[PDB]
Every structure is written in C-alpha cells, then in structure tokens.
Amino acid sequence: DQAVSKQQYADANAAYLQSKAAVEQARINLRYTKVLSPISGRIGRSAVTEGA
Amino acid sequence: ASVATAYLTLKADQAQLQLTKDTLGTYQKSFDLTQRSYDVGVASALDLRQAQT
C-alpha cells in the first residue's frame, strides 16, 4: 500500500541480503571447522592425533 | 469614522487575500513536488498526505 517508501525498502532488502551473506560466511566457516575430505580414496594414517 | 474604518478593513482584507493566494501557490508547488517525488518511490504515502492536508 506504499506506507513505506521503495527507497527504504530497497535499503532494507539490501541489508537483509548483506546480513544473509555475512551469516553464510559463518556457516561455511563452521563447515571449515569440521574437516571434509576433498576427494575419495584410501586415506593413510593421521599425522596429528586428537588434542594436538 | 465608520466609512474610514470600512474602507481600511476592505484594503486590509484584500491585501491578506493576496497573501493567502500566494501561500496557496507555494503550497501547490510543494504538493506537486511531493507528487513528483512520490511516483518514483523516494517519498512514501505519508509526506504526500501531509502536503495534501
């Protein structure tokens, strides 16, 4: 009903998309905390153990 | 005395009528500037209603 301007709707939508990018940054950083194997095959032995 | 006061209040009401017409002109210029700034989306439908009132 245009009770709020399109300018301060585009600003709020830009803030929403920018904050969603800044939270998917932390989501892929939590994806980097756990270690995902990049390719498949015979894994060898652990060079560092639990706690190192 | 009565015809002097009547002629002076006639001149004063015509002068402030001219001033009220000029303020109506400036308010109409404010209204169509706000209507120009309403179509593209800078101003919402609240400042337009204030200028309309």
UniProtKB/Swiss-Prot annotation, chain A:
Subcellular location: Cell inner membrane
Protein induction: By growth under severe iron limitation.
Loss of function: phenotype: Disruption of MexA, MexB and OprM significantly reduces active efflux of N-(3-oxododecanoyl) homoserine lactone/3-oxo-C12-HSL/PAI-1, but not N-butyryl homoserine lactone/C4-HSL/PAI-2.
Description of how the protein assembles with itself and partners: Component of the MexAB-OprM multidrug efflux complex, composed of six MexA subunits forming a hexameric tube, binding to a MexB trimer, which interact with the trimeric OprM outer membrane channel protein. OprM is thought to not directly contact MexB; instead, MexA joins MexB and OprM by forming a funnel-like hexamer anchored to the inner membrane. MexA may initially form a hexameric ring complex with MexB prior to OprM, then OprM undergoes a conformational change as it contacts MexA, allowing the periplasmic gate to open.
Membership in a protein family: Belongs to the membrane fusion protein (MFP) (TC 8.A.1) family.
Extra facts: In both X-ray crystal structures approximately the last 100 residues are not ordered.
Function: The periplasmic linker component of the MexAB-OprM efflux system that confers multidrug resistance. Functions as the major efflux pump for n-hexane and p-xylene efflux. Has been shown in one study to be involved in the active efflux of the autoinducer N-(3-oxododecanoyl) homoserine lactone, thereby playing an indirect role in quorum-sensing; but has been shown in another study not to be involved in efflux of this autoinducer. Over-expression of the pump increases antibiotic and solvent efflux capacities. Implicated in the secretion of the siderophore pyoverdine.
Name this polypeptide is given: Multidrug resistance protein MexA
Lineage per the UniProt record: Bacteria, Pseudomonadati, Pseudomonadota, Gammaproteobacteria, Pseudomonadales
Encoding gene per record: mexA
UniProtKB/Swiss-Prot annotation, chain B:
Subcellular location: Cell outer membrane
Domain of life of the source: Bacteria
Traits of the deletion mutant: Disruption of MexA, MexB and OprM significantly reduces active efflux of N-(3-oxododecanoyl) homoserine lactone/3-oxo-C12-HSL/PAI-1, but not N-butyryl homoserine lactone/C4-HSL/PAI-2.
Induction: By growth under severe iron limitation.
Quaternary state and interactors: Component of the MexAB-OprM multidrug efflux complex, composed of six MexA subunits forming a hexameric tube, binding to a MexB trimer, which interact with the trimeric OprM outer membrane channel protein. The OprM homotrimer forms a 135 Angstroms-long pore. It consists of a beta-barrel, which is probably inserted in the outer membrane, and an alpha-barrel formed by alpha-helices which probably spans the periplasm. In the ground state the periplasmic end is closed, while the outer membrane end opening is 6-8 Angstroms in diameter.
Primary role: The outer membrane component of the MexAB-OprM efflux system that confers multidrug resistance. Functions as the major efflux pump for n-hexane and p-xylene efflux. Has been shown in one study to be involved in the active efflux of the autoinducer N-(3-oxododecanoyl) homoserine lactone, thereby playing an indirect role in quorum-sensing; but has been shown in another study not to be involved in efflux of this autoinducer. Over-expression of the pump increases antibiotic and solvent efflux capacities.
Entry similarity comment: Belongs to the outer membrane factor (OMF) (TC 1.B.17) family.
UniProt name for this protein: Outer membrane protein OprM
Species this protein is from: Pseudomonas aeruginosa (strain ATCC 15692 / DSM 22644 / CIP 104116 / JCM 14847 / LMG 12228 / 1C / PRS 101 / PAO1)
Phylogenetic placement of the source organism: Bacteria, Pseudomonadati, Pseudomonadota, Gammaproteobacteria, Pseudomonadales
